[PDB]
From a paper:
In order to elucidate the molecular mechanisms of inhibition, we determined the structures of a 2, 6, 9-trisubstituted purine inhibitor (N-(cis-2-Aminocyclohexyl)-N-(3-chlorophenyl)-9-ethyl-9H-purine-2, 6-diamine) with [name] and [name]. The 2, 6, 9-trisubstituted purine inhibitor (CGP74514A) has been described as a potent and cell-permeable inhibitor of Cdk1/cyclin B (Giocanti et al., 1999; Wang et al., 2003). To shed light on this conformational plasticity of group II PAKs, we identified small-molecule inhibitors and used them to trap the kinase domains in their closed conformations. Binding of adenine-mimetic inhibitors to the active sites of [name] and [name] resulted in the expected clamping movement of the two kinase lobes and closure of the active site, as will be described below. In [name] and [name], the inhibitor interacted with conserved active site residues. The binding orientations of the purine scaffold in [name] and [name] differed slightly; however, the mode of binding was identical to the one observed in the Src kinase complex (Dalgarno et al., 2006). As an example, the interactions of the inhibitor and the [name] kinase domain are described. In [name], and in the analogous residues in [name], the inhibitor forms two hydrogen bonds with the hinge backbone residue Leu398. In addition, several hydrophobic interactions with the active site residues Phe397, Ile327, Ala348, and Val335 in the N-terminal kinase lobe and Leu398, Leu447, Gly401 and Val379 in the C-terminal kinase lobe are present. Similar rearrangements of helix αC were also observed when the [name] inhibitor complex was compared with PAK4Etgly, suggesting that this novel, to our knowledge, mechanism is conserved in group II PAKs (not shown). In the PAK4EtGly structure, the corresponding arginine (Arg359) forms hydrogen bonds with the phosphate moiety of the phosphorylated activation loop residue S474; in the [name] purine complex, Arg359 forms an indirect interaction with that residue via a sulfate ion present in the crystallization solution.
PAKs are serine/threonine protein kinases that are regulated by Rho GTPases of the Cdc42 and Rac families (Knaus et al., 1995; Manser et al., 1994; Martin et al., 1995). In humans, the PAK family comprises six members, which are classified into groups I (PAK1, -2, and -3) and II ([name], -5, and -6) based on their domain architecture and regulatory properties (Bokoch, 2003; Jaffer and Chernoff, 2002; Kumar et al., 2006; Zhao and Manser, 2005). Group II PAKs ([name]–6) regulate a wide variety of cellular functions, and PAK deregulation has been linked to tumor development. Comparison of five high-resolution crystal structures comprising the kinase domains of all three monophosphorylated, enzymatically active group II PAK family members revealed a number of catalytically productive and nonproductive conformers presumably representing snapshots of catalytic domain movements during catalysis.
Numbering used by the authors: 299 to 341, 344 to 590
Write the structure that this text describes.
Amino acid sequence: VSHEQFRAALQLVVDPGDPRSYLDNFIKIGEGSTGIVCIATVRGKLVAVKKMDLRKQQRRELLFNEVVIMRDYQHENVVEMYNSYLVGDELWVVMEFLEGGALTDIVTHTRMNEEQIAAVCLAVLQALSVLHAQGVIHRDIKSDSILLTHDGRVKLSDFGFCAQVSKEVPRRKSLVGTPYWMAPELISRLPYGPEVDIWSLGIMVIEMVDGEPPYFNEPPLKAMKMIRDNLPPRLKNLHKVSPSLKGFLDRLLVRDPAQRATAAELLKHPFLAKAGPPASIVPLMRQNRT
Ligand SMILES: CCn1cnc2c(Nc3cccc(Cl)c3)nc(N[C@@H]3CCCC[C@H]3N)nc21
Ligand SMILES: [Cl-]
């Protein structure tokens, strides 16, 4: 499929026009897999703009999947998209700005308690149960993909790797994700489904408890071989965690995806009863630390 034809299909979907009319004061706040993210001001609300080069993608079709999903799925725990545009060779998606940043910064700089860990898992499982029911697989669940509001509410972001399964095509086979968070069946190149996100969430629980995913200091291909061949990873800090948290994590990090717990199942797990309110996360954020 041609670039001119791909851009053409995307043009049918995005908002027409040049948003450099509506926006100014662009400040780069980071980089992802698919492009860069800036903050900008509307002509006075401030927004986040993700900018992706149509010609520089390993899997260009995923750009399409991204826009269509956030357009079609609004949930309290999912980052809201306001608009999307084509600007030269770039797809721009305009989204709400979340002042609390990403969970990565919390997990690498602080130790979360179980109330805080439970609140983050509850929020993510709520988003995923709704997405999974409609056949949407996120495929990049990790702390970097979890954003926080000023008052400590959790929002799933970074839908640039998502896919949708259906009755007609109920499994994917593509190798998409981030090595250390990838489910064994996905690493192995087997037909997979929504269950891959449950494993990835398990790995993000490890991040929240231990600060890092398993095998993080290994080359990514070596970590993927270990994920694929070995017993499920265990918490380095095990004696430090409750029986509720261990039993919860034991249901996520199940190698056989057919025996892995679903998002709907896990929403009924007693560990999530520990979830604290959003205000419990606030003191973990960079702006409130010293
Ligand atoms: C859904 C798009 N989006 C809205 N608001 C975002 C966001 N907020 C903040 C808030 C405070 C500091 C920073 Cl660095 C980002 N960060 C943000 N972070 C970057 C985006 C790409 C690189 C990884 C991730 N940390 N993404 C944000
Ligand atoms: Cl249990």
